[PDB]
């Protein structure tokens, strides 16, 4: 009878308020914080009214209606947001749709700066609620497409870091490494979110469904293809709605399928226990990040149903996709250690083959070498992992990063130096975060990270194209979007830059800089050094890097910094210029 009272009761006053806040923030991104805190109170006083009497006036209205109604209460709506106020003249079906429309994705607001640990902790003390609500409001208005409940999930992890660290003697050493982790986790989570909706739009349902099938069947290797199909179907509807940006429609669609999975739990996965015992607002998130189930191990084989058994072209022509979907389902679940793309890379190969064999005299003997063709497709990413995780051990994260720097700068020297550095730094991290895992969980790991990075890297070329090559892979299918980069070859067309002493003039500042800064500084010159002399051997370059490692010491450990950087520096650039000939 009352949508509001209902949401209140199973959500709770605490979470209800937080969400209302995030909600209004994602829409009225220009209104001040103190302004929303009022709305949230206004709205919460209301809800409480319905919980007491479901019949109380307006409690019968739909949330989409009540919401829109309040939004149109903002007097400065016309002045502040303008065009968006026009929405208030249409009635509900259109109105809400009209709001989702004029919702700015990335509004021009000032970069949020992280205050001093001590000022943070102190602010967290006098008024911890308003402290978090304000930063919640700040993050919200900056990412209006971000799933509220998930945003609320990060919020609490932040309060646990402030609760724990602001009590320690060494606050900074406690707080800082967590704030860095959370930041990088929310960034990753946001990018994937914006990444999923992009794929759904560029390649469409089929590709998305294929993807989902392989991933779903990897997690639930015991569920039957029928169930997987069901879920993959419901799933895609969810992401279509959530992408569209309607909070309520997306919140319910996710709640439903979460209930369906938990009720039919025993028919899906054994590792869904906990997730199903959690509250409404967390079940979904829980399930989505759930672990793989153990595989039947009583499994037959694939060459039996997909390479041998005549009547494959019969079963294939009857329902081309379901058949292929079965292949995936079948192959995926037997390989939780492959990357989803890898699997889609195989399914496609199979599709391609079936299409060039079911149209020949004796098909049975045309596609009997297929599996043999999966071999190279599998080993490429497998070799890449070992190779790169081996090197990451031979050198630290930092020393490893420099290897990539030199490696990629050579591929696309055209790319901006500050870009090559950042990109090269993130790749190193992916390497450290994943190489820690055993062979089994490696490939899936790399895929998770490499996916966002590669996209983030592509979105830039999107605004400032530089290389036709980087542009060729960025546009290609998500399934070829990675092996393409791995295929780039050192650019021989590139014409070396000209010397600029300034770029190789290091004044005694570096001596007093944080590791983050000392590196970025050194690394930036490294890229510049390769852009200048791109034909330097891994040998020639190692040398210059050595004569520079010592140099830094000899001048930031000597009684006359500044003189050492100018006198000794002239010797490096000179000697170096000559070494690299």
Ligand X SMILES: CCCCCCCCCCCCCC(=O)O
Q: Which residues bind ligand X (CB under 6 A)?
A: 7, 19-20, 23, 63, 112, 114, 132, 135-136, 139, 149, 154-155, 158, 179, 183, 251, 254-255, 258, 280-281, 283-284, 339, 341-342, 381, 384-385, 388, 402, 408, 411-412, 415, 420, 423, 427, 430-431, 443, 446-447, 450, 457, 482, 485-486, 504, 522, 525-526, 529, 532, 544-545, 548-549, 572-573, 576-577
Token output for 167: 């009590």
CA distance 222 to 295: 6
CA distance 220 to 350: 23
Q: How far is the CB of 274 from ligand B3I (least distance, A)?
A: 15
Could you tell me if 63 and 248 are in contact, meaning their C-beta atoms sit under 8 angstroms apart? yes
Closer by beta carbon to ligand B3I, 78 or else 157? 157
Closer by beta carbon to ligand X, 95 or else 532? 532
Q: Is 461 annotated as contributing to ligand binding?
A: no
Closer by beta carbon to ligand B3I, 29 or else 189? 189
Q: Closest Cα to residue 211, out of 69, 339, 86, 95? A: 339
Closer by beta carbon to ligand X, 33 or else 504? 504
For tokens 């937080």, what's the residue? 18
Its sign, for the CA torsion 385, 387, 393, 396, is: negative
CA distance 270 to 54: 40
Q: Is 507 annotated as contributing to ligand binding?
A: no
Q: How far is the CB of 336 from ligand X (least distance, A)?
A: 14
Q: Is 509 annotated as contributing to ligand binding?
A: no
Q: Is 64 annotated as contributing to ligand binding?
A: yes
Closer by beta carbon to ligand X, 19 or else 88? 19
Q: Is 241 annotated as contributing to ligand binding?
A: yes
Note the helical H segments in 244-339.
247-263, 273-276, 280-288, 303, 312-318, 320-333
Q: Is 246 annotated as contributing to ligand binding?
A: yes
Closer by beta carbon to ligand X, 329 or else 548? 548
Site string for ligand B3I, 228-247 (x = CB under 6 A): ---x---x--x---------
Phi-psi bin for 491: left (phi > 0), alpha (psi -120 to 50), beta? beta
Q: Closest Cα to residue 119, out of 166, 81, 180, 159? A: 166
DSSP of 314-383, one letter per residue?
Answer: HHHHHSHHHHHHHHHHHHHHT-TTS-HHHHHHHHHHHHHHHHTTTTSS-GGGTSTTTGGGHHHHHHHHHH
- Give the contacts of 226 (CB within 8 A, at least 6 positions apart): none
Q: Does 413 bind ligand B3I (CB under 6 A)?
A: no
Q: Does 258 bind ligand B3I (CB under 6 A)?
A: yes
CA distance 545 to 542: 5
Q: Which does 190 bind (CB under 5 to 8 A by kind): ligand X, ligand B3I, none?
A: ligand B3I
**Piece of 120-128, 283-291, 323-331, 461-469 that binds ligand B3I (CB under 6 A):** 283-291
Q: Does 139 bind ligand B3I (CB under 6 A)?
A: yes
Binding residues for Zn(2+): 64, 244, 246
Q: Which residues bind ligand B3I (CB under 6 A)?
A: 139, 143, 146, 151, 182-183, 186-187, 189-190, 216, 231, 235, 238, 254, 257-258, 284, 287-288
């Amino acid at each position: 009878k009352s949508e509001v009272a209902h949401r209140f009761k199973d959500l709770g006053e605490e979470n209800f308020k937080a969400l209302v806040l995030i909600a209004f923030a994602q829409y009225l991104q220009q209104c001040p914080f103190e302004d929303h805190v009022k709305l949230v109170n206004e709205v919460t006083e209301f809800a409480k009214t319905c919980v007491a009497d479901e019949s109380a006036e307006n409690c019968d209205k739909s949330l989409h209606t009540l919401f829109g109604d309040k939004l149109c209460t903002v007097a400065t709506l016309r002045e502040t947001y303008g065009e968006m106020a026009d929405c208030c003249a249409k009635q509900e079906p259109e109105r809400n749709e009209c709001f989702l429309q004029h919702k700015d994705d990335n509004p021009n607001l000032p970069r949020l700066v992280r205050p001093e640990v001590d000022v943070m902790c102190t602010a967290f003390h006098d008024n911890e609620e308003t402290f978090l609500k304000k930063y919640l409001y700040e993050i919200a208005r900056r990412h209006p497409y971000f799933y509220a409940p998930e945003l609320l999930f990060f919020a609490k992890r932040y309060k646990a870091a402030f609760t724990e660290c602001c009590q320690a003697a060494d606050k900074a050493a406690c707080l800082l490494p967590k704030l860095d982790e959370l930041r990088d986790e929310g960034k990753a989570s946001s990018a994937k979110q914006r990444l999923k909706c992009a794929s759904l739009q560029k390649f469409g349902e089929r590709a998305f469904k294929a993807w989902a099938v392989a991933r779903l069947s990897q997690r639930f290797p015991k569920a039957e293809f029928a169930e997987v199909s069901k879920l993959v179907t419901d799933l895609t509807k969810v992401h279509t709605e959530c992408c569209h940006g309607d909070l309520l429609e997306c919140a319910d669609d996710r709640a439903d399928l979460a209930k369906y999975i938990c009720e039919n739990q025993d028919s899906i996965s054994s590792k869904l226990k906990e997730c199903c015992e959690k509250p409404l607002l967390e079940k979904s998130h829980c399930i989505a990040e759930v672990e793989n189930d153990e595989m039947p191990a009583d499994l037959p084989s694939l060459a039996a149903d997909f390479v041998e058994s005549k009547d494959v072209c019969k079963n294939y022509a009857e329902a081309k996709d379901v058949f292929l979907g079965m292949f995936l389902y079948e192959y995926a679940r037997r390989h939780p250690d492959y990357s989803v793309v890898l699997l889609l890379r195989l399914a496609k190969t199979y599709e391609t083959t079936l299409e060039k064999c079911c149209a020949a005299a004796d098909p049975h003997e045309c596609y009997a070498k297929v599996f043999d063709e999966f071999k190279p497709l599998v080993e490429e990413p497998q070799n890449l992992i070992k190779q790169n995780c081996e090197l990451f051990e031979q050198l630290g994260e930092y020393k490893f990063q420099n290897a990539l720097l030199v490696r990629y700068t050579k591929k696309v020297p055209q790319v901006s130096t500050p870009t090559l550095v950042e990109v090269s730094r993130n790749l190193g991290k992916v390497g450290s975060k994943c190489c820690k895992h055993p062979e089994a969980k490696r490939m899936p790991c790399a895929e998770d990270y490499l996916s966002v990075v590669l996209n983030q890297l592509c979105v830039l070329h999107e605004k400032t194209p530089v290389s036709d090559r980087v542009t060729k892979c960025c546009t290609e299918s998500l399934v070829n979007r990675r092996p393409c980069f791995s295929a780039l070859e050192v650019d021989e067309t590139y014409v070396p830059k000209e010397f600029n002493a300034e770029t190789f003039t290091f004044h005694a500042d570096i001596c007093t800089l944080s590791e983050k800064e000392r590196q970025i500084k050194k690394q930036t010159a490294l890229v510049e050094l390769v852009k200048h002399k791109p034909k330097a051997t891994k040998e020639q370059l190692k040398a210059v890097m050595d004569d520079f490692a010592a140099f830094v010491e000899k001048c930031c450990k000597a009684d006359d910094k500044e003189t050492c950087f100018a006198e000794e520096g002239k010797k490096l650039v000179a000697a170096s210029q000559a070494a690299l000939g």
